[PDB]
C-alpha cells in the first residue's frame, strides 16, 4: 500500500474548486491513486463525546478528532461519489482509497462498512 503523509501536500494531489455545491476548495487527484492507498494520520483536537469518531473495541465512541491538506478533502454525499473511507489504526484516523482513483477526480471521504 502507498502511504501519503498528512504533513505536506502529496505530489499525487492538487487543490482546486470542489465539484460539490457548498464547500469551496477540494482535493483532486493529479496522478492515478491506487486502490488501498492510505493517507494520514488525520490530526486535530481530541473532543470528549471536520470531525471523526474514534471508536472503542466494542464499537462505541471513545472521542472525536476535530480539525493538514487532508482538511481540504470534502465529504462524499453518498457511496456513488465516495472514493475514500475513514479507517482507524489504533486510535489514529487515516483515509483509504476504496478503489483505484483516476487523475483529475475529486477525493471524497466518508465512513466505510
Order of strands across the widest beta sheet? 1-4-10-9-11-8
Rg over alpha carbons = 14 Å
Compressed to H and E, one letter per element, the order equals EEEEEEEEEEE
Number of domains: 1
Calculate the terminal CA-CA distance, rounded to whole Å: 20 Å
- Percent strand equals 35-45%
**Helix count from the secondary structure assignment:** 0
- The CATH topology is given as Beta-clip-like
- Structural category is mainly beta
CATH architectural type: Beta Complex
Shape, per Cα inertia axes: globular
Q: Main β-sheet, in a few words?
A: 6 strands, mixed
CATH secondary-structure class = Mainly Beta
Family: Belongs to the class V-like SAM-binding methyltransferase superfamily.
Subcellular location: Nucleus
Domain SET: 11-112
Protein name: PR domain zinc finger protein 12
Explain what this protein looks like in three dimensions:
By secondary structure, the protein is mostly beta strands. The protein has one domain: SET domain (Beta-clip-like, Beta Complex). It has no helices and eleven strands. It starts with a strand and ends with a strand. It is classed as transferase. Keywords: PR domain-containing protein 12, PR domain zinc finger protein 12, Structural Genomics, Structural Genomics Consortium, SGC, DNA-binding, Metal-binding, Nucleus, Transcription, Transcription regulation, Zinc, Zinc-finger, transferase. The assembly is monomeric. Methyltransferase domain of human PR domain-containing protein 12.
Amino acid at each position: 500500500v502507498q502511504k501519503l503523509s498528512s504533513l505536506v501536500l502529496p505530489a499525487e494531489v492538487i487543490i482546486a474548486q470542489s465539484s460539490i455545491p457548498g464547500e469551496g476548495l477540494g482535493i483532486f487527484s493529479k496522478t492515478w491513486i491506487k486502490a488501498g492507498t492510505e493517507m494520514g494520520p488525520f490530526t486535530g483536537r481530541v473532543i470528549a463525546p471536520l470531525m471523526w469518531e474514534v471508536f472503542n473495541e466494542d464499537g462505541t465512541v471513545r472521542y472525536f478528532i476535530d480539525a493538514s491538506w487532508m482538511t481540504y478533502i470534502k465529504c462524499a454525499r453518498n457511496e456513488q461519489e465516495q472514493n475514500l473511507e475513514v479507517v482507524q489504526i489504533g486510535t489514529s484516523i487515516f483515509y483509504k482509497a476504496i478503489e483505484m482513483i483516476p487523475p483529475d477526480q475529486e477525493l471524497l471521504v466518508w465512513y466505510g462498512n
